[PDB]
Write an enzyme that holds these catalytic residues in place. Structure first.
Site, PDB file in Angstrom:
ATOM      1  CB  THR A   6      -3.036  -3.950   4.219  1.00 23.33           C
ATOM      2  OG1 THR A   6      -1.963  -4.353   3.950  1.00 23.33           O
ATOM      3  CG2 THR A   6      -3.345  -2.454   4.006  1.00 23.33           C
ATOM      4  N   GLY A   7      -1.566  -4.698   6.899  1.00 25.68           N
ATOM      5  CA  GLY A   7      -0.140  -4.492   7.538  1.00 25.68           C
ATOM      6  C   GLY A   7       1.066  -4.167   6.707  1.00 25.68           C
ATOM      7  CB  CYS A  31       1.460  -8.261  -3.737  1.00 28.37           C
ATOM      8  SG  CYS A  31      -0.248  -8.081  -2.988  1.00 28.37           S
ATOM      9  NE  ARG A  64      -9.927  -5.751   0.102  1.00 31.20           N
ATOM     10  CZ  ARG A  64     -10.632  -6.639   0.406  1.00 31.20           C
ATOM     11  NH1 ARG A  64     -10.837  -7.932   0.053  1.00 31.20           N
ATOM     12  NH2 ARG A  64     -11.357  -6.681   1.736  1.00 31.20           N
ATOM     13  N   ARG A  68      -2.613 -33.296   2.050  1.00 26.97           N
ATOM     14  CA  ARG A  68      -2.957 -32.179   2.896  1.00 26.97           C
ATOM     15  C   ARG A  68      -2.020 -32.020   4.075  1.00 26.97           C
ATOM     16  CG  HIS A  91      -4.854  -4.895  -3.669  1.00 29.79           C
ATOM     17  ND1 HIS A  91      -5.183  -6.066  -4.174  1.00 29.79           N
ATOM     18  CD2 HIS A  91      -3.411  -5.039  -3.215  1.00 29.79           C
ATOM     19  CE1 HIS A  91      -4.127  -6.616  -4.455  1.00 29.79           C
ATOM     20  NE2 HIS A  91      -3.237  -6.417  -3.344  1.00 29.79           N
ATOM     21  CB  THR A 135      -7.291 -11.029  -3.826  1.00 26.03           C
ATOM     22  OG1 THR A 135      -8.101 -10.546  -2.661  1.00 26.03           O
ATOM     23  CG2 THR A 135      -6.162 -10.065  -4.100  1.00 26.03           C
TER      24      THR A 135
END
Lengths: 331, 331, 330, 330
Positions: A209-210, A150, A232, A78, A177, A180
């Site tokens: 999204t940036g 991406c 999405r 971890r 997109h 995910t």
């Protein structure tokens, strides 16, 4: 002389990075870390719903992974600081847990014996970001770097060609997109993103999204000229950017196509692609280019206001360019 | 005189139980508990990808839920023992976290001021299970009971009619089951079920289930005569049982249909349904019957070996029968 | 080498063509459909299910050039004017789903072909042959059927179970992927009302003859099996669910070993065996027409068992069409 | 009350019928399609997208009895033999997608109808009217078009933005749900090669005239907008993505208030407004043809902004068809 890579995090990006590394003779995976039994790691590598069965052989022997006759050390630590990367001689760590996306958490790999770290996501701090086709020549020996996102890997190369040739005044992007791992199968709690908790397979889901604004970091000439958002949609893989841009220098659509084709066949051969075929998303499942320009899908209102379409396998393309960044900061 | 219910767990079952309770005049929801802000709970209740917008009005005021003019106490307690159910006068707790599915963990509700507990899943211990249409008359005043599973609620009523009329020698069941919250949107880790970690929307996913064998608990005459398995398929809701049975007494398919129709129009009016229409899964989104017999879909090889098809909304039907069990152990 | 013409460039026709590139004993020389070369090249180049064509496709003078081979492209409705002898076609892969009888398929032999394989179950008494089941029962017939994709999955598993334990009676369900006959949203389907409902939204019950057809290729199972199907929202890959009564009592572990033995023995390449936590996509591209899922199955007792077997209803069936072509050409 | 006949019982025809049951000013008295009463009752009873029909459906003597009302069922190809006057049809909802011009639709008036509304954009100069955009521009014409589902979403939002800030130029994308024209798996689509690929697997680029059609219903926007579409694997509900340049500089908060004001004012029922974390399914059944998503949009500066607006491409458009019927009947 091969670059020895350890992978921290065996999620979507980590496993596709591993699969892409088998095809490259200059990069070798020597260790995988995640909270998974070695046998489970072999199963996730063997079988992929999106990309098919592993091209090769994977087996487990004495707690280790055997992949095409190569022994992979498997750990389940971890704390990244107890990874003992030096025991397996790892040069670069592909930090792909999506959790240690800052210089201070990712530096634990260098403490643990690694020489350099590549983050497989956009940095939450100012860790420099590098996109192939955009700013690889701007790497200045940093030991911790980010491969951005991406989506940035799709927008940045196309943005460079358009800006270099016609000058981008201003642009707004939408990425249609694919689903995910952060999304949910049915309506469920997602405290950090209420929209993202709704059933992925039932819904078109807007998200922020940036990645577009991040292009101004890898392309500083475009610093405050790009932003956008995301939708999405219920696809397992492959996304597409929808780039609406204003041009300084007037250009016909035929001139834009020719400029993209030239860069795709020239300085960006491996990064930017070009097609005039009647392509759909699945046609880019497995695409290595981080940006394939869709000539017929785009449309112009006039010579200074145009909408440009570019595909990307948000798993395969990004994973291949992660390896490109590994090798660029080593080679 | 309404039964006051607290809901522990605002997942799929908890929210659909809440929605079904608004339609019943004998059951009142007075408190919801989950690790969610009151505003988030209102959002999940307001909007449902599967069942549409809430029929009514929901708002938040001073940390409380206002649903059709009724104040709902909202808490976010991890330990069920500090739920203070007595402060809101809760009679029965619908334990719907899927996590406290045993007498010892669920008893914490009775300690916390509740009088009785209904588990919205099959018990992991011997907490008695009750399926409407199967064994409600066998309830003997227990303060903790289970409503079994959504699949058992479909198989048990149909099993009773077939056994009572023709005698089941032996049966094997398959449930073609919709995606649930435990599955993943893309290939991911699911330590307790490797198949279940594969992308739900891409795959037919085999899974094991005790729901068929559990029928022998609510129908002891069928104790060792039923078992089966499941196929998870990319649908957001609604499942169907595929029951292959051997009969002691020979019966034509016309006689089976007539026996089911009679029970559906008779002793099982609210539980078991009957149709001869060309139905598909979405036709039962919102179905209250826990088992709708598909007459045309079934098929017989002979008078003693037959395959029977029965639909169920694994969300709505089960949720309504949870309320039926609440009221049965109170009324 | 066997020269093959494909009549019908649908799902089965296109995947048969792709599978033929891997075999050195079979070559496609002509395709017929009402579609024209430019469209055929596009459908062959790009596939949503199986990825891009492995090789090169181009168009020249109304004909296809595929991996350096010229393919004649025609658009003839009547098979009797197909002029198969002009392109040297030996066997015709009849894949329109429309000419499924000896008299319509005989028009291919009239047009110059030597033998015909129908890529579906025959509507008349044209003999059916399933690899692993009854290929050794071929007696030189010039028109044969390869049965259905579902029959090619059930028949090999049924044979192993019957040969080893004796099937008294069985009921089968195939959880089947979406096919071209379905609709994207609720729409008219006169021949099957259930089948016109939106494929991506629904579990759709449908009929199938595949189980009783097993009684044709395995006469020992005549009238011992029947069943039906559920079409589900997956683009490809299906699975048979076979509930059977056994004469000889057998533990599930004994059933597993008998299937594994046949998969590693007499049915290698036809029947597969796995104990892995597999899902449907793991068989997208599977060549075996039947892969036994050991962990998915379950037994109630030693005489009543449920057996699960996967099949790529496109790739597996397409490969066995070529397997039948080569078998009837020996 | 306006008596309506529906020619074409596809998606738009069936949802128009369902929406008409809620309005006391419009009643459907006749349906025409090549489908027969028994099938029509089944398609009306059960809907994968919108659930079971709210009411009662039965068949009697080849006719439909729906909520106690007898509906004449015919299967006439030529609209001139539709005998609309025999059933007292006032307005015809032309919903076959086939008769989209004044001369073909005039056959309805020939057959006894008074006025015709096409449930699609006119292929000739038949005037188009969008609620919230230019209903006040109706001058008594007997044949009109309700434009497209996408135009009904873009036109009201475009009007508010243009009226308040002035659109210099705009490019629009509609992320659109799967429709009946697509295929379940890769298949032939001569008129659109991209459109023949498997709908459930793919993001599919497609063309749309909806943006330029906004320049027809809002002449002030003539030649200022264009764009395209991405068909995605959802059964229903779409969303427009409008990137525009503004003459008057406006913060995004100022844009939001202007839309909200119009939604609560002059466009109530046509244009909606939300600040909630909505997704597509939240508008399955939406009556508003355009619901502005405040949080989804984003601005680069005060003159370059991206605006998001949802629409149920089935329900919203269907309700406004009835809205146009009633407007041209006043």
């Amino acid at each position: 002389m091969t670059i020895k890579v350890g992978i921290n995090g065996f999620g979507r990006i980590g496993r596709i990075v591993f699969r892409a590394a088998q095809k490259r003779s200059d990069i070798e995976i020597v260790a995988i870390n995640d909270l998974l039994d070695a046998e489970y790691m072999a199963y996730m590598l063997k079988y992929d719903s999106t990309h098919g069965r592993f091209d090769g052989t994977v087996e487990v022997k004495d707690g280790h992974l055997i992949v095409n006759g190569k022994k992979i050390r498997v750990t389940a630590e971890r704390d990244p600081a107890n990874l003992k990367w030096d025991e397996v001689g790892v040069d670069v760590v592909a930090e792909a847990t999506g959790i240690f996306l800052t210089d201070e958490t990712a530096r634990k790999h260098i403490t643990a014996g690694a020489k350099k770290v590549v983050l497989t996501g956009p940095s939450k701090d100012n860790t420099p970001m590098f996109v192939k086709g955009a700013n690889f020549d701007k790497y200045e020996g940093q030991d911790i770097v980010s491969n951005a996102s991406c989506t940035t890997n799709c927008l940045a190369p196309l943005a460079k060609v358009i800006n270099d040739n016609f000058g981008i005044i201003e642009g707004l992007m939408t990425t249609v997109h694919a689903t995910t791992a952060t999304q949910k199968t049915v309506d469920g709690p997602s405290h950090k993103d209420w929209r993202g908790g709704r059933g992925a397979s039932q819904n078109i889901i807007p998200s922020s999204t940036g990645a577009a604004k991040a292009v101004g970091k890898v392309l500083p000439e475009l610093n405050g000229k790009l932003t956008g958002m995301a939708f999405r949609v219920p696809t397992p893989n492959v996304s597409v950017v929808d780039l609406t841009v204003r041009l300084e220098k007037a250009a016909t659509y035929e001139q834009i196509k020719a400029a993209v084709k030239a860069a795709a066949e020239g300085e960006m051969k491996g990064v930017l692609g070009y097609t005039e075929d009647d392509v759909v998303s699945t046609d880019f499942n497995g695409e290595v280019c981080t940006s394939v320009f869709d000539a017929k899908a785009g449309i112009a209102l006039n010579d200074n206001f145009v909408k440009l379409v570019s595909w990307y396998d948000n798993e395969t393309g990004y994973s291949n360019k992660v390896l490109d960044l590994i090798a660029h900061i080593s080679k």
